[PDB]
C-alpha cells in the first residue's frame, strides 16, 4: 500500500506517534516519506548484510528477524514480514520501542539526513487531523 501524505499523518496520529518521545507528528511523516516513500512494502538491502523493511524501514540486524541476517537480535520480537503489512500497527509498535532509547529518531538514517532539524511541521499542513 502506498499511503497519501495526509492519510498517513492521520494514521500515525491515531497510532499515538504525535509527540511520542517528544517527536512531533511531522517528524514521523517526514521519516516515512524519505525512508519508504510512504510504501508499506518498501524493502532495501544494505551492504552490511541487513535489510530494512516497511513504512519505517526497520532493520533486520537489530529489530526484526528475517532469517537471513547474521548477528540478528530481533529486539522487537517479530518476523520482518510483519513490517510489510498495509496495517502499520506492527511497524509503529516496533518504532516506539526503537525511539524510546536515547538516540531517539536518529535510528532512522533517511530521517536524520532529510528531516532532522528541518521544518517538519510542513509535512502535516493541509491535513485534516
Amino acid at each position, epitope marked *: 500500500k502506498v499511503f497519501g501524505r495526509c492519510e498517513l499523518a492521520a494514521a500515525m496520529k491515531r497510532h499515538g506517534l504525535d509527540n511520542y518521545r517528544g517527536y512531533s507528528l511531522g517528524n514521523w511523516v517526514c521519516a516515512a516519506k*524519505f*525512508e519508504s*516513500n510512504f510504501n508499506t512494502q518498501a524493502t*532495501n*538491502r*544494505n*551492504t*552490511d*548484510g*541487513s535489510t*530494512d523493511y516497511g513504512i519505517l*524501514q526497520i532493520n533486520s540486524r537489530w529489530w526484526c528477524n528475517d532469517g537471513r541476517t547474521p548477528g540478528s537480535r530481533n529486539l522487537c520480537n517479530i518476523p520482518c514480514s510483519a513490517l510489510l503489512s498495509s496495517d502499520i500497527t506492527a511497524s509503529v509498535n516496533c518504532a516506539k520501542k526503537i525511539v524510546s532509547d536515547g538516540n531517539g529518531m536518529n535510528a532512522w*538514517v*533517511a530521517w536524520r*539526513n*532529510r528531516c532532522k532539524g528541518t521544518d517538519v511541521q510542513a509535512w502535516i499542513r493541509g491535513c485534516r487531523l
Partner: nanobody
Amino acid sequence: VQLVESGGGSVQAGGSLRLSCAVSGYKDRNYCMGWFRRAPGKEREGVAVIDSSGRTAYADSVKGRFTISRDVALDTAYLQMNSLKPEDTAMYYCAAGWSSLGSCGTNRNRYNYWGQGTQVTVSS
C-alpha cells in the same frame, strides 16, 4: 562533488553492457556509490550499491546478473550487467550518498549527488 558516467546503449537480450561512474569532490572515501534505474512509467529503483569496504547489495531483480565493483582509491565504480533482459531497459543513474558507519543501502533518498544518467535499451 561531480559525477561522470559512461557506457550504456542498445543490446540484444542475453547480452551484456558495462557502465562506469567516476566521482570527484569528496574529501575522503567515506561515502556510498550505487546505480538507480527508472523504467518507463516507473519510479527509480536502486539496483546495486557498494560501500568503501567493497561490500555490495542488490535488488532481487538483478542479483547474480549485475555486479557492482569499486576502485575505492580511484573514486570510481563499475556496473557489469550480464544476461540482460528486456525488463532491464531504463535510464540508469549513478549516485553518491552518505554512508552510515560504513554501510550503504538501496534507498535513493540517501543519495544526494546524481548525474545525467545513461540509457540502456535491451531488445528482445
